[PDB]
Amino acid sequence: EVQLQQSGPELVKPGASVKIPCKASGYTFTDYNMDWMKQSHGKSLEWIGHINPNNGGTFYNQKFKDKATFIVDKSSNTAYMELRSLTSEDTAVYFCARGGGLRRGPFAYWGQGTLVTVSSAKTTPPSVYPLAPNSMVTLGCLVKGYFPEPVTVTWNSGSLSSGVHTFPAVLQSDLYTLSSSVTVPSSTWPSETVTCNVAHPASSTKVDKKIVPR
């Protein structure tokens, strides 16, 4: 099956550049364009341009001429988009998508998106605090005082996901805080084990906080 796989989130200083990979598999890479999109937070998408991997050719949305460069590594079926002279206006999710081959068409296959945050603020890992307290029981995980976004949260590595609510982070005094609840039967907890799995890619934090009965 077709897969487009992008890099993880990126914190970049103002004025610097970043390069975003998009690795393709499940089809013959040189048959199709690779297109690139930008989506600012809370906003619609903008098409940056595309590259023809077969022959190296490119077309840029004029608006992105001073911002984006496309290249491909035919050798590894990886398309790349470089963004230069970064400002806060470039903070956004960037997506690759497979484009036209023999003729124009829709974007049927997309990469997962990569978040680029432009800031010169320092990186701060979160503290992960457990929350302990009735046929059902709700348990929590508090992820506090981090920068930048994102963190990811799972419960028992994703096997337990059915009664999870993970709340969007709030920015406070230059720091994000996020929470996440989970609800399971009384019979299963505190009887057997529940832990939240928290990662903060920007600091390489990966914590497992077990929910201990108080």
């Binding site: 068409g105 997309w110 709700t138």
Partner: protein
């Protein structure tokens, strides 16, 4: 460029009913060949996902609840019947002319029966206490509709109260929210009862959770 204006900006549609989402091009597209207008569904934190391509063709794997039509400058996505899984933002897109462009998006809310929140309060964990910090957390889970009010020792305090709503759940069409009252160590240690009362149009009486310390 060719500007695509979507209508409505938002709508709320009951389960089983019809949602009509419009896209208007700033100028007409050209009759030589096909018309490259496509429709996508996008949920939070995901790429958009293709529904309809070349105005009216159904992408394989997409159910026939989704239909596209149009011509020249007017294009229509219909979702009938609407289901819980449709809670999303929808976009039209054109690649008839450079640069390619997307509509501004239409946010579909699923309207369902009103639902009271389940409310849980949590005192700060001792791990957090060892760091000289005290946060008291309240979860308000699986309610409808979205509009909701929450109030946190006998009396009240809004200073240090970070709130946060989820998007619409795509299985049961509910919303959840999370209120975190945070305050200092010797400040927290200095009090008694902590209550989150929440009020919501599912009842007269606020739902009250609390603990003594």
């Amino acid at each position: 460029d060719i500007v695509l204006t979507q209508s409505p900006a938002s709508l709320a549609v009951s389960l089983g009913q019809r949602a009509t989402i419009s896209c208007r091009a700033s100028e007409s597209f050209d009759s030589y060949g096909n018309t490259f207008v496509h429709w996508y569904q996008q949920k939070p934190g995901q790429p958009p996902k293709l529904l309809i391509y070349l105005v009216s063709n159904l992408e394989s794997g997409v159910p026939a609840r989704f239909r596209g039509r149009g011509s020249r400058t007017d294009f229509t996505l219909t979702i009938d019947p609407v289901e819980a899984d449709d809670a999303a933002i929808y976009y039209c897109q054109q690649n008839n002319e450079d640069p390619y462009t997307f509509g501004g998006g239409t946010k579909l809310e699923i309207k369902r029966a009103d639902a009271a929140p389940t409310v849980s309060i949590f005192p700060p964990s001792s791990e957090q206490l060892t760091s000289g910090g005290a946060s008291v957390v309240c979860f308000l889970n699986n309610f409808y509709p979205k509009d909701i009010n929450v109030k946190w020792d006998g009396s009240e305090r809004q200073n240090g109260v970070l709130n946060s709503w989820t998007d619409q759940d795509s299985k049961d069409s509910t919303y959840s929210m999370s209120s975190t009252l945070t305050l200092t160590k010797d400040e927290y240690e200095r009090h008694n009862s902590y209550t989150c009362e929440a009020t919501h149009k599912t009842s007269t009486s606020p739902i009250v959770k609390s603990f003594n310390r």
